[PDB]
Amino acid sequence: SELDKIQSELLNYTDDTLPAMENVDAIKDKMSYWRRTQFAVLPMKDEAQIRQTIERNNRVQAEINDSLVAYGKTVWPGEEEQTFKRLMGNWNAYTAVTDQFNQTLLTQGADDAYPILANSLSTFEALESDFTLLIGILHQAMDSNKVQILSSVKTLNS
Ligand SMILES: NC(=[NH2+])NCCC[C@@H](N)C(=O)O
Protein backbone atom coordinates (compact mmCIF):
# COMPACT_ATOMS: atom_id res chain seq x y z
CA SER A 1 0.00 0.00 0.00
CA GLU A 2 1.00 3.60 -0.65
CA LEU A 3 0.29 4.42 3.00
CA ASP A 4 2.48 1.61 4.31
CA LYS A 5 5.17 3.01 1.99
CA ILE A 6 4.98 6.29 3.90
CA GLN A 7 5.22 4.46 7.21
CA SER A 8 8.15 2.32 6.12
CA GLU A 9 10.06 5.24 4.60
CA LEU A 10 9.45 7.19 7.81
CA LEU A 11 10.49 4.27 10.02
CA ASN A 12 13.69 3.74 8.05
CA TYR A 13 14.44 7.47 8.41
CA THR A 14 13.65 7.80 12.12
CA ASP A 15 14.94 4.43 13.29
CA ASP A 16 17.83 3.66 10.93
CA THR A 17 19.12 6.70 9.06
CA LEU A 18 18.79 9.33 11.76
CA PRO A 19 20.32 7.14 14.50
CA ALA A 20 23.19 6.33 12.15
CA MET A 21 23.79 9.99 11.44
CA GLU A 22 23.43 10.98 15.09
CA ASN A 23 25.81 8.19 16.12
CA VAL A 24 28.49 8.87 13.54
CA ASP A 25 28.25 12.58 14.28
CA ALA A 26 28.65 11.91 18.00
CA ILE A 27 31.56 9.56 17.41
CA LYS A 28 33.25 12.10 15.15
CA ASP A 29 32.69 14.75 17.82
CA LYS A 30 34.11 12.48 20.53
CA MET A 31 37.04 11.47 18.31
CA SER A 32 37.79 15.13 17.57
CA TYR A 33 37.65 16.06 21.26
CA TRP A 34 39.77 13.00 22.08
CA ARG A 35 42.32 14.12 19.49
CA ARG A 36 42.60 17.55 21.07
CA THR A 37 43.03 16.03 24.52
CA GLN A 38 46.06 14.19 23.15
CA PHE A 39 47.61 17.55 22.35
CA ALA A 40 46.08 18.92 25.54
CA VAL A 41 48.21 16.60 27.70
CA LEU A 42 51.49 17.88 26.24
CA PRO A 43 51.84 21.23 28.05
CA MET A 44 51.13 19.28 31.25
CA LYS A 45 53.93 19.23 33.83
CA ASP A 46 52.70 17.07 36.74
CA GLU A 47 53.37 13.46 35.82
CA ALA A 48 50.40 12.16 37.83
CA GLN A 49 48.05 14.60 36.06
CA ILE A 50 49.64 13.45 32.80
CA ARG A 51 48.99 9.84 33.85
CA GLN A 52 45.41 10.73 34.83
CA THR A 53 44.63 12.46 31.54
CA ILE A 54 46.05 9.61 29.49
CA GLU A 55 43.87 7.18 31.47
CA ARG A 56 40.83 9.36 30.79
CA ASN A 57 41.86 9.69 27.13
CA ASN A 58 42.22 5.92 26.88
CA ARG A 59 38.75 5.49 28.37
CA VAL A 60 37.42 7.82 25.68
CA GLN A 61 39.38 5.91 23.05
CA ALA A 62 37.70 2.65 24.08
CA GLU A 63 34.32 4.37 24.04
CA ILE A 64 35.02 5.61 20.53
CA ASN A 65 36.12 2.13 19.60
CA ASP A 66 33.06 0.47 21.13
CA SER A 67 30.81 2.98 19.38
CA LEU A 68 32.59 2.33 16.09
CA VAL A 69 32.27 -1.42 16.52
CA ALA A 70 28.57 -1.10 17.32
CA TYR A 71 28.04 1.30 14.44
CA GLY A 72 29.75 -1.14 12.07
CA LYS A 73 27.04 -3.70 12.82
CA THR A 74 24.42 -1.32 11.42
CA VAL A 75 26.16 -0.30 8.18
CA TRP A 76 24.49 -1.07 4.90
CA PRO A 77 26.35 -2.78 2.07
CA GLY A 78 28.01 -0.69 -0.57
CA GLU A 79 29.83 2.58 -0.05
CA GLU A 80 28.99 2.86 3.66
CA GLU A 81 30.31 -0.57 4.63
CA GLN A 82 33.34 -0.02 2.40
CA THR A 83 33.94 3.38 3.96
CA PHE A 84 33.40 2.02 7.44
CA LYS A 85 35.89 -0.78 6.79
CA ARG A 86 38.44 1.79 5.66
CA LEU A 87 37.68 3.93 8.69
CA MET A 88 38.29 0.97 10.99
CA GLY A 89 41.66 0.41 9.33
CA ASN A 90 42.61 4.04 9.84
CA TRP A 91 41.22 3.92 13.36
CA ASN A 92 43.42 0.94 14.16
CA ALA A 93 46.35 2.74 12.52
CA TYR A 94 45.64 5.81 14.60
CA THR A 95 45.14 3.93 17.86
CA ALA A 96 48.45 2.17 17.17
CA VAL A 97 50.02 5.62 16.85
CA THR A 98 48.10 6.71 19.95
CA ASP A 99 49.35 3.80 22.02
CA GLN A 100 52.88 4.76 20.90
CA PHE A 101 52.23 8.40 21.79
CA ASN A 102 50.90 7.43 25.22
CA GLN A 103 53.76 5.04 25.90
CA THR A 104 56.17 7.82 24.89
CA LEU A 105 54.36 10.58 26.81
CA LEU A 106 54.37 8.42 29.95
CA THR A 107 58.06 7.48 29.61
CA GLN A 108 60.00 10.30 27.91
CA GLY A 109 57.68 13.31 28.24
CA ALA A 110 55.80 15.63 25.94
CA ASP A 111 58.98 16.72 24.11
CA ASP A 112 59.39 13.26 22.51
CA ALA A 113 55.66 12.45 22.42
CA TYR A 114 54.56 15.48 20.40
CA PRO A 115 56.39 14.38 17.21
CA ILE A 116 54.38 11.14 17.11
CA LEU A 117 51.19 13.13 16.59
CA ALA A 118 52.89 15.83 14.50
CA ASN A 119 54.43 13.38 12.01
CA SER A 120 51.44 10.99 11.79
CA LEU A 121 49.02 13.53 10.31
CA SER A 122 48.47 11.38 7.23
CA THR A 123 47.30 8.58 9.55
CA PHE A 124 44.91 10.80 11.44
CA GLU A 125 43.77 12.72 8.35
CA ALA A 126 42.81 9.44 6.66
CA LEU A 127 40.72 8.58 9.72
CA GLU A 128 39.11 12.01 9.67
CA SER A 129 38.34 11.84 5.97
CA ASP A 130 36.63 8.48 6.45
CA PHE A 131 34.32 10.08 9.03
CA THR A 132 33.73 12.94 6.63
CA LEU A 133 32.88 10.57 3.78
CA LEU A 134 30.70 8.48 6.09
CA ILE A 135 28.88 11.59 7.31
CA GLY A 136 28.48 12.55 3.66
CA ILE A 137 26.93 9.17 2.90
CA LEU A 138 24.53 9.49 5.82
CA HIS A 139 23.69 13.09 4.93
CA GLN A 140 22.87 11.80 1.48
CA ALA A 141 20.78 9.03 3.01
CA MET A 142 18.87 11.52 5.15
CA ASP A 143 18.04 13.73 2.22
CA SER A 144 17.20 10.76 0.00
CA ASN A 145 14.97 9.46 2.81
CA LYS A 146 13.19 12.80 3.07
CA VAL A 147 12.69 12.85 -0.68
CA GLN A 148 11.25 9.33 -0.52
CA ILE A 149 8.95 10.26 2.36
CA LEU A 150 7.77 13.45 0.68
CA SER A 151 7.25 11.53 -2.53
CA SER A 152 5.28 8.77 -0.82
CA VAL A 153 2.92 11.35 0.75
CA LYS A 154 1.81 12.32 -2.73
CA THR A 155 -0.81 9.59 -2.29
CA LEU A 156 -2.52 11.91 0.22
CA ASN A 157 -2.99 14.56 -2.48
CA SER A 158 -5.09 12.03 -4.46
N1 LIG B 1 22.13 2.35 9.54
C2 LIG B 1 23.28 2.61 8.94
N3 LIG B 1 24.40 2.65 9.66
N4 LIG B 1 23.34 2.86 7.64
C5 LIG B 1 22.18 3.00 6.78
C6 LIG B 1 21.56 4.37 7.01
C7 LIG B 1 20.94 4.87 5.75
C8 LIG B 1 19.81 3.96 5.29
N9 LIG B 1 18.83 3.80 6.36
C10 LIG B 1 19.17 4.53 4.05
O11 LIG B 1 19.86 4.69 3.05
O12 LIG B 1 17.98 4.84 4.03
135 by Cβ neighbours in 10 Å (0-12 / 13-18 / 19+) ranks as: middle
| Distance between first and last Cα of the chain | 14
Instruction: State the method.
Output: X-ray
Query: Are the CB atoms for 90 and 130 separated by under 8 Å?
Result: yes
CB within 8 A of 102, min separation 6: which ones? 54, 57, 58, 113
What span, in angstroms and rounded, lies between the C-alpha atoms of 32 and 18? Answer: 21
Give the residue among 141, 61, 46, 68 at the shortest CA–CA distance from 94. Answer: 61
Exposed e or buried b for every residue in 27-49, given b needs 16+ CB within 10 A? Answer: bbeebeebbeebeebbebeeeee
Among protein residues, the one with the nearest Cα to ligand 1's atom 7 is: 17
Domain extents in the chain = 2-157
Per-residue burial over 142-152, b if 16 or more Cβ lie within 10 Å, else e, is: eeebeebbeeb
Q: Which CATH architecture has domain 2-157?
A: Up-down Bundle (1.20)
Nearest C-alpha to atom 6 of ligand 1 is from which residue? Answer: 17
Pocket of ligand 1 (CB under 6 A): 12, 16-17, 20, 74-76, 80, 141, 145
Q: Which atom of ligand 1 is nearest to the CA of 137?
A: 7
Q: Resolution in angstroms, to 1 decimal, for this deposition?
A: 1.9
